[PDB]
Amino acid sequence: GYSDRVQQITLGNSTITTQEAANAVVCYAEWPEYLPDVDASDVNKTSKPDTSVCRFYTLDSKTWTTGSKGWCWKLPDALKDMGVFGQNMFFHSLGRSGYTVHVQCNATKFHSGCLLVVVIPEHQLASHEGGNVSVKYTFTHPGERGIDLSSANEVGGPVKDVLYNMNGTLLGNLLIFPHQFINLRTNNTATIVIPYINSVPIDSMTRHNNVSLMVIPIAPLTVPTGATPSLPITVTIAPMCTEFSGIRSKSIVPQ
Amino acid sequence: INYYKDAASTSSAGQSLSMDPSKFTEPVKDLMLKGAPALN
Amino acid sequence: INYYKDAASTSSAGQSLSMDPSKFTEPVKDLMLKGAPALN
Amino acid sequence: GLPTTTLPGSGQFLTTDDRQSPSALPNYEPTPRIHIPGKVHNLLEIIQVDTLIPMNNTHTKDEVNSYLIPLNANRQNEQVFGTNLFIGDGVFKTTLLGEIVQYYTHWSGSLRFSLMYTGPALSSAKLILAYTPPGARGPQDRREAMLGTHVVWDIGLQSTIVMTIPWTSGVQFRYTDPDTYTSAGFLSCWYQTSLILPPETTGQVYLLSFISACPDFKLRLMKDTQTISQTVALTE
Amino acid sequence: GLPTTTLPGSGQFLTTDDRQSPSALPNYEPTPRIHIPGKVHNLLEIIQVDTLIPMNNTHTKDEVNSYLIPLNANRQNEQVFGTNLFIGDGVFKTTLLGEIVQYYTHWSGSLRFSLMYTGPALSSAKLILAYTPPGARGPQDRREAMLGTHVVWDIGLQSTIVMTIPWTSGVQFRYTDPDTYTSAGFLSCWYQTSLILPPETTGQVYLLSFISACPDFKLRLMKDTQTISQTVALTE
Amino acid sequence: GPALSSAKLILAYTPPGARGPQDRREAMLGTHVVWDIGLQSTIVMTIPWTSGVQFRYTD
Amino acid sequence: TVASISSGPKHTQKVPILTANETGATMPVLPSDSIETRTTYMHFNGSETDVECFLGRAACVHVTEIQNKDATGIDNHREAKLFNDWKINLSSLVQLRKKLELFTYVRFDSEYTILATASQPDSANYSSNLVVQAMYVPPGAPNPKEWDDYTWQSASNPSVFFKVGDTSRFSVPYVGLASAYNCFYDGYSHDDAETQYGITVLSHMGSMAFRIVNEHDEHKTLVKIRVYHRAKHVEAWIPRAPRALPYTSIGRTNYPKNTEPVIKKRKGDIKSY
Numbered sequence A: 001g002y003s004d005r006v007q008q009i010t011l012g013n014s015t016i017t018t019q020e021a022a023n024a025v026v027c028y029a030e031w032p033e034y035l036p037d038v039d040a041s042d043v044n045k046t047s048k049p050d051t052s053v054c055r056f057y058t059l060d061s062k063t064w065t066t067g068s069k070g071w072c073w074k075l076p077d078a079l080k081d082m083g084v085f086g087q088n089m090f091f092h093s094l095g096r097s098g099y100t101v102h103v104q105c106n107a108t109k110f111h112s113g114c115l116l117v118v119v120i121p122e123h124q125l126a127s128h129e130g131g132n133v134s135v136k137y138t139f140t141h142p143g144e145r146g147i148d149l150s151s152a153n154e155v156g157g158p159v160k161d162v163l164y165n166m167n168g169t170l171l172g173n174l175l176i177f178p179h180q181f182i183n184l185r186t187n188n189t190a191t192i193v194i195p196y197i198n199s200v201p202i203d204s205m206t207r208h209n210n211v212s213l214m215v216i217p218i219a220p221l222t223v224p225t226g227a228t229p230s231l232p233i234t235v236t237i238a239p240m241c242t243e244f245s246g247i248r249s250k251s252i253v254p255q
Numbered sequence B, C: 001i002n003y004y005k006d007a008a009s010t011s012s013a014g015q016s017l018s019m020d021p022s023k024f025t026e027p028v029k030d031l032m033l034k035g036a037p038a039l040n
Numbered sequence D, E: 001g002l003p004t005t006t007l008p009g010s011g012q013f014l015t016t017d018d019r020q021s022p023s024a025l026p027n028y029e030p031t032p033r034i035h036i037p038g039k040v041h042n043l044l045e046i047i048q049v050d051t052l053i054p055m056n057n058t059h060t061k062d063e064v065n066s067y068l069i070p071l072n073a074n075r076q077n078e079q080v081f082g083t084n085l086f087i088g089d090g091v092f093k094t095t096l097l098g099e100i101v102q103y104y105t106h107w108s109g110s111l112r113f114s115l116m117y118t119g120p121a122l123s124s125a126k127l128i129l130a131y132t133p134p135g136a137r138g139p140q141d142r143r144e145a146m147l148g149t150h151v152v153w154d155i156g157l158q159s160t161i162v163m164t165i166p167w168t169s170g171v172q173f174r175y176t177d178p179d180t181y182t183s184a185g186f187l188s189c190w191y192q193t194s195l196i197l198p199p200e201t202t203g204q205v206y207l208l209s210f211i212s213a214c215p216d217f218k219l220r221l222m223k224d225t226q227t228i229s230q231t232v233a234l235t236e
Numbered sequence F: 001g002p003a004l005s006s007a008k009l010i011l012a013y014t015p016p017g018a019r020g021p022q023d024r025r026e027a028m029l030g031t032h033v034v035w036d037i038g039l040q041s042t043i044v045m046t047i048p049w050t051s052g053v054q055f056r057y058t059d
Numbered sequence G: 001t002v003a004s005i006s007s008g009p010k011h012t013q014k015v016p017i018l019t020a021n022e023t024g025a026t027m028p029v030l031p032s033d034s035i036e037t038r039t040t041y042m043h044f045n046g047s048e049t050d051v052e053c054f055l056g057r058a059a060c061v062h063v064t065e066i067q068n069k070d071a072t073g074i075d076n077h078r079e080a081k082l083f084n085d086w087k088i089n090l091s092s093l094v095q096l097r098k099k100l101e102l103f104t105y106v107r108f109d110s111e112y113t114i115l116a117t118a119s120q121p122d123s124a125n126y127s128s129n130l131v132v133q134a135m136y137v138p139p140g141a142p143n144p145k146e147w148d149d150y151t152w153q154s155a156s157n158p159s160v161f162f163k164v165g166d167t168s169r170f171s172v173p174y175v176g177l178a179s180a181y182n183c184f185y186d187g188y189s190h191d192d193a194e195t196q197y198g199i200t201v202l203s204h205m206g207s208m209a210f211r212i213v214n215e216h217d218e219h220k221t222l223v224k225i226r227v228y229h230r231a232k233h234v235e236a237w238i239p240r241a242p243r244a245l246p247y248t249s250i251g252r253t254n255y256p257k258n259t260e261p262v263i264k265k266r267k268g269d270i271k272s273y
Ligand SMILES: Cc1cc(CCCCCOc2ccc(C3=NCCO3)cc2)on1
Pocket: D024, G088, G089, G090, G091, G110, G112, G134, G135, G136, G158, G159, G160, G172, G175, G181, G182, G203, G205, G208
């Protein structure tokens, strides 16, 4: 009586149940694991807070309306302030982590709409100015708020044009990245497990984000007659196999 | 025959002949069998 | 393959892979053990 | 001194030849490799992942909406969409498949075309997708369409339908840049019965459509893509 | 006559290639080697010998005094010295380590920083040395400093203290010429308790400081040093 | 609720030492379960024994 | 290898063509799951789509130019193209660039070919064979200032001397600092508020510098350098969506404003063929 459909994920002191899942994606078919010695470089023993950092943090909720263009969060940024995960983050020189991402959106059998939930490794954004204008730090570190693709261009911020993925590629091809759809008629959640993907064994958690999670409405939300025209979307994310190394004074970052 | 000492100096590599699209085409956690229902 | 008769005409030598810094880093007459006191 | 003779071609530089060269950095030791998920070995590995087709091309500036094929409730017998199968041009051209095919001169193989339905769960519909092999015109009505490769799709719990365009061909390779002799057919879709919405519901519903290549597929003779060009060198 | 084809690069002179050449002096017999103490095989052998760092760089013309870090009796909580760790520049630059690092583009490894105390034997002191890994600012007070790599040094019979800056890094190599992304941290030193001089004694005492590389160390991709140049050829 | 409705609730247990949470952000950092309302009508949350002292007073 | 097996009529409870794309998988459906097929063999291996093959041919990565002329009274050799350099990079010319950016991280050895041809714009006499010197100047090396500085001694820095009209060729191991080169980098060099964003911060591989060794003749001679790059021993990870809009800068993803629709509009209906 197991269905692909019902699932439970327990991680730390927190549990999620979905009764309307559509399997789960594990990026590149690899599950998060700690850093092996053969791959290690820094000689420091690392710190593995385990259950105090590897639990589920639910970010603040978004509201899908008929005019929504899509939202974008960066990792580990989105979690920069969650509990002890965040403290560890500002206090060590280097850290590394994988995540379980669970995006939630329920409706009824009269609604229609379909969101794309995708994880993009190394999502370098484009400046809407063109040329070689850079995208300032603050703009690519929105924190739990994430970036709202239907917000206005700002100065020093990225471009927010959806048919171009914020980088000069077409929305249609985002499907080459680990992703899952939430089609109100099928699905009510999306779950993706992200292994740590980098060109170095461990890195800085503040100067470099290693994935952007993106939720994009593709088939517009259509509510039943005289229904309220909107649904909330909630994102809950859990660091998994986290390791921190090179402890010290506590980083100070712009803004 | 390599005439040179360093590995960078050798010619192109030879075909992976690796080929396994499943990391890209089927990264699902619970295995899906073709023919069985997608969602049970 | 050497094409030439004299030794000077051969290519560069190949790595010493000798490496022993102690003549420079520890030329002391009575051996010092790390962890034992320097001056007894 | 060993006697030699040099042949025609001596001194030429062929950008495609593969030979040994002296290393400028004798004895240098590269950084160790660490493990990174995701290694690609063949472009054939990636063109099997499906991506969305902007089938609804009828707009005037690129929009998320050209990915949506609309469906109308209560129409009978009528046609949902049509396209030829020049995978290197037209709707296909910006898709990952289209985009890679363009790096090669010839392609052969089967294509997989699927449609995922997004209408309310309490609605229902039966569509027919038809592949018309080279030699006939794009079908003009379902009767015409239904006499070639087709699948009656019944919209249900299982949200997507995967149609295969089996390789139908005299010549074993076709050109990726559209060519007549080498042309592959048409793909059309019609209401088999009709879309029906539940009460309290209204308007258009949309289908999303994807394209990817079957394991069947072959691409050969690499060349340059018409999809990218430039007028002056870029700088930092 | 055997048929050949010559490739691109024929006739070039690459200063780094290693091939055979005819000897101009056929059959000449070199002088026998005799034994000489001191043979060097690797530059890695010599960068492990420690040499003095002109830490006290604050003078205006080079002087023996910039090798001396002064210490003041009776100060509490305060800071003895500070420096970043760009081994290819600044204090490090003229040291043997600094001087060799400059022949290579990349370095990786642990550094050994030691301090030898020279104050009267009847004095006493406790200092803290702190290494701050990349990512934070140079510490501004001991509280800040003590939260990173540190050693409380107790001045005693044993005159020197050897602090190691363990390799703390994401990227496995850093640039020897100062670069941000690639930067290595800061090194600071503060009074842990304070220097105390015996009676009949007065003034400043000094610490000498050395730097050498741990056996850990790697240097790669040789290049030319900014440390030497010229405007006309020399003559006899 | 009617069978054709849907809902997702979070239940949170806050162990001794902090105040009753004032908003979900605060609540979600302690023991919690996201409940998805479905066919399966009930959700069972456990308040695991979190305690220094091995017994508490009932009063 | 069979490309298609033989398959006949089906009337089952086992439907391989109905799936749920919401899952993120592309189910491996074949012609034989939905029509009746006959056996056929592949006759093909997929050799020429190997990434080593795809990135393994020489591409032009840079065209520069230097001139041989009397430097007498020139206050800025660099500025007179008495010698010139190049801030090495592989993203400046954009044909090879789109190919590499199909991947996120890439690792390979490089084989460079340098073609140098001469031009004599101002009506001339006898051209004495010019010899070009290409020398690699890595980060933190005395950058050269005149066309005949001590720098050109290049006692520790690899340099090649070849003749104009000829070609020079040599190969450099993978010089990246990490395990792979980042084709993309969503980071900064540090957490400052105004520091550049991108890879340019990551990819400072130093510059290459060219000059003519010859002193000047009576006329002036323009020498134009073309650098070709061939990847050998390629390794690529994490495929990405291909580049759709035009490029504007080395190292940023930025596209131009008021660009044109990249998807071709139908001449007709959705229903059109
Ligand atoms: C990404 C990415 C990859 C690359 C290429 C890096 C190549 C390493 C440095 O390139 C050279 C170039 C020229 C020489 C040279 N030595 C003597 C003459 O030319 C040496 C290394 O650039 N960006």
